[PDB]
Nucleic acid binder design. Structure first.
Lengths: 282, 281, 281, 282
DNA sequence: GACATGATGCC
DNA sequence: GGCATTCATGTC
DNA sequence: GACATGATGCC
DNA sequence: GGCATTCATGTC
């Protein structure tokens, strides 16, 4: 029903694929022509379906009855998830050749920072696929099933995970420290200590984040990028990034990434997806 | 020309009137058929125009080209300002006759939690007309002018106010402590330590706000009310509220207001805008 | 057979009586002519016997073999416990008739600040008699027995109390918060956070002690008085003192006691042991 | 006047030699057969004189009239300064060969932890002689001169040093950070945050001390050794110690030192005062 | 990956 | 020597 | 109104 | 007693 605009080009196949690789069973459903998932906004709950319309650079959004009262907020969440604000001419013209292969690349955000926070923590160490598996388990045990849509389940709320037994979370396939990290996060969410929207001083906020137990700088950076859609952060501690820069120290990697300012988040995404990229031969 | 729904009844006259009295010159323009104001998301900017369609039970929103890239977020901000989510049959079903006279009453939110915190602070002790004349000075001195629309001006950002000279703020017409509060508040905004959206535990969040310099219980409650649109808060420390509950102490009032849980914020609005109202026996 | 002199007059009957009511079973032994207790200085342990010789106004201190390596430290502890430094002329010639009925009165100190800290907390609320018994139960559960003196037990160290089970301490007959107060005080002594000797700014030091869980103003003043032997602290919050100043609020009492600076601690003792006493209106 | 015992052997010549080299004019006097210094215990001030008695294995202590009211504490202070508690058979029987040459070695303590902390800081990065003169000036400037013995001045009180102008101290011959380090130490002493007696967990206590400005691991260790007379601390970061363990790093020296637990402080002394001492090759 | 921990220059 | 800051380890 | 100070009821 | 919390009160 609702419709939002975007600026061409937009690589939807890339986006939908990025999301499917990380999709959580019972929460999300990704296809080649649409994206759908459970969504909670306060006590309002339902299903959101996003259908891209290439021919007209439009994104059609449908909301089940339970979300209609907070429609505009659901749209906002969706626009942050898909980076509809992106102007590719600006970014590509700045990254130059690094983005030429896929100019329609966008930054995959989230629909809820707390959720992304939990996702990031569970993304620690393991493969993208294993994290998706792990998150699906946390969701199954602590999530709420939708009454109108049985097949779906809402992502575990902050209050439900805050009152979760560390031993139980551990039993799902994570170390005790990780489970504690999740619980602490939920408490920060309840108290409003976890920025839910992008803060004015990203660098500073990431520091405060790193004081959180179980949250190192990789998690803080990745969370900044996905949870806040911060556009100028690189991930020099990333597993795949260390590979892309063979034999380089975390600090050299960024003095390097420094050339992509102020769109280092986009450069990061391009490097991750350039099969055989290597630093300039010079 | 975007469109958003709302559920009847909706007292637009009352809403626009409430915003009109607190309207900040150059930032907001309030008429009785529409509301408009400057708006900044990140640093995409423009002007927003909201026009109620009583006929269709709809709110029409127009955005200038500079905000189009972030249209959705803009629509969300308006839906919070106008309490479009409200189901009046549920609130009134609970408040009984307290809300029977003005079933279309809504909670006036805000477009940005930071701006609202600043308004809250600049609203202390002084009158409503004053706060508005003062806030306008600030927005005039630290606001971002729109090239697209010269007449309008964006509300100060936290970075712009965090780097502000205290004395400079004071000279605009406020005690030094106030100006200091604004600067602290702005910093907190910069490092995400100020909840920009309603937290799960509103009580805890408000307590934490009270450790902020220049922020007492009244300011935290009012902030929670408009800033987060928390629906179950009361202001037992409010000037007018004390007059509405003659001789009762903050604790006695708060005890009385418990009868309106979980919609105390709405109860508050009704008692505020119902002069001569008084507690039962 | 060690000797430390004092200045007459010295009311030994009053001192022993005071320590007698607070004596902890298995730790201390008090009679009309001597004081005896177990003492530990680091890993050196043994029994200390103090025998006052009025005739020559000198205190005879005997140390079991286990404490000889640290004889001096033991002597210093006795001197602090018995306030042998006091010049009663300077105090009595400063308190007037307040301290005229008993000019030999002294500030009963302690042998170890941590111990006194524990006694202070356990001294909260309950009577002297119950506190003594409560404390005895703690020493019995965590104290170290002496090989050469099976009847004696060493007062618990911070090492043991810090590793104590809150529940174990609770079962001894104390609120959970009280046991938690002990465990925290013990951790503080382990990290050197608990001043074991009178600090330069007693007021500041006490204010900091009040940040400790379970330690309010009364415990901090009393600890400062007995644990650091601070000579100028009053206890406006004390029960007996409240009765000595009927109708007066802590601030009034506090203001009244200012007339006794800088020997308020002594003034406190005298007012405590003068059933008649009443202020001047 | 007063007499304290000690267990033989006791190397008085070595002990007085160590104190003499670090003696502060105006505060102390060290001679072949005696030690003397000003001493303040609250408002009681005077001069303490210590004369060893080899024939009797005793230390004779004389106090000037001004300290008699607090005689016992003065005796205790001297006992800590001269390590009278030490049972050499236990240490040597444990240190073995290391202390076989000088079985009468003792741990030079202090008469006041605050004072010692100050000396510890003033002794940073300079020669023993330099520190002595530096300290003497600090003493003459903020100390209390004795009326009965004009040539003696009591070491500066915390209250006095806390209210000192950072610049006046710098002028005496120390960096500006060194002066603030002293002022900070002084306020800590005023509030009761600087442990004046040995804490139960020396390790934790030192860790906290290192949070003090101007105080690093070296100063914290040295302070524990002298100010608290901790008997099981080593100083792997000491310049001289590094020369005694050529080519080894702090972690290695430290690892090797563990063989002397629980008397690492005595080991340190024996090594410090042993010329071409070197670890075992094997 | 989080986190404790050990190994050039400047002030 | 205190101290800031960047690599290289190395359990869990 | 925020904010120091003082001055009832549940652990 | 410790401590959270309430009700003046005087100031900025």
């Amino acid at each position: 029903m609702y419709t939002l605009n975007w600026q061409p080009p937009y690589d939807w196949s890339w986006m939908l694929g990025f999301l499917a690789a990380r999709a959580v069973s019972s929460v999300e459903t990704v296809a080649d022509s649409y994206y759908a998932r459970s969504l909670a906004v306060g006590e309002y709950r339902g299903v959101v379906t996003a259908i891209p319309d290439i021919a007209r650079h439009t994104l059609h959004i449908n909301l089940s009855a339970g979300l209609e009262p907070v429609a505009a907020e659901c749209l906002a969440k969706m626009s942050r998830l898909f980076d509809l604000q992106c102007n590719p001419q600006i970014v590509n013209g700045a990254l130059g050749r690094l983005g030429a292969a896929r100019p329609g690349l966008r930054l995959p955000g989230c629909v809820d920072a707390f959720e992304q926070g939990v996702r990031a923590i569970l993304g620690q160490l393991v493969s993208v696929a294993m994290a998706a598996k792990l998150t699906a388990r946390v969701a199954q045990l602590y999530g709420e099933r939708l009454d109108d849509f049985p097949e779906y389940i809402c992502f575990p709320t902050p209050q439900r995970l805050a009152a979760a037994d560390p031993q139980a979370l551990k039993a799902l396939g994570m170390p005790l420290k990780r489970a504690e990290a999740l619980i602490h996060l939920a408490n920060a969410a309840l108290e409003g200590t976890l920025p839910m929207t992008i803060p004015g001083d990203v660098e500073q906020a990431m520091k405060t984040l790193q004081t959180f137990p179980g949250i190192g700088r990789w998690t803080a950076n990745y969370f900044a990028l996905r949870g806040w859609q911060a556009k100028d952060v690189f991930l020099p501690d990333d597993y795949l990034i260390k590979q892309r820069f063979p034999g380089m120290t975390p600090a050299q990697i960024r003095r390097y990434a420094e050339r992509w300012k102020p769109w280092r988040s986009y450069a990061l995404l391009h490097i991750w997806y350039t099969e055989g990229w290597q630093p300039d031969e010079a």
